[PDB]
Amino acid sequence: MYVRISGRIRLNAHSLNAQGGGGTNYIEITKTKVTVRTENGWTVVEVPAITGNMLKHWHFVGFVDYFKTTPYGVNLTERALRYNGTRFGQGETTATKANGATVQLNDEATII
RNA sequence: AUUGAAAGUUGUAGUAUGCGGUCCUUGCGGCUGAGAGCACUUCAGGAGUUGCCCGCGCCAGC
């Protein structure tokens, strides 16, 4: 099954996907350039935006939440329960399941 | 079909997690919209005008 969704969302008073850190004063929101008409040739304007990484991570969070309750919820990484998106970072060969069982990252079949 | 023929610089990644622009504060105290002032002074509801003129309580009644 393949599905595609596209639409518009109203959204006001949102500090989503800021730039600066917590300890730094004046946390700034992310900006991105877009190209529009303005009843003449093409012009680029800088507008607030939310990156696709943020959306993908929150989809991951929702999927983990809705897959935990299923009877096959044991088949999950321990990092997933922590909402940790770092899947098999640099410098490791084995991973830990949700129940504590170890899994070897040798073949894709067993991993999936 | 030619320095030629095939050739992903690629796959995973939340610049995040917490945080009262807050606590105290009389736009308050005193202050006559007050004192002097005739809506007064002179004015006939007045002069003239018949409740008039004619009229049997009447004739027959032992």
Side-chain angles (χ1 to χ4, degrees), chain A residues 64 66-77 80-81 97-99:
Chain A
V64 160
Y66 273 82
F67 190 69
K68 275 189 310 182
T69 62
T70 55
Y72 296 106
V74 57
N75 292 300
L76 205 63
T77 317
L81 268 64
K97 218 183 181 171
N99 64 347

Side-chain angles (χ1 to χ4, degrees), chain A residues 70-91:
Chain A
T70 55
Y72 296 106
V74 57
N75 292 300
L76 205 63
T77 317
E78 202 185 68
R79 298 138 175 254
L81 268 64
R82 295 209 300 281
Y83 299 156
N84 205 1
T86 180
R87 261 166 297 278
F88 316 139
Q90 295 178 357

Side-chain angles (χ1 to χ4, degrees), chain A residues 6 17 21 23 28 30 34 39 44 48 52 56 67-68 71 77 79 81 83 87 90-91 93 101 108 112:
Chain A
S6 306
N17 189 179
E28 179 180 358
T30 50
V34 292
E39 64 95 25
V44 295
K56 187 168 165 49
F67 190 69
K68 275 189 310 182
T77 317
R79 298 138 175 254
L81 268 64
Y83 299 156
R87 261 166 297 278
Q90 295 178 357
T93 306
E108 194 181 3
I112 71 165

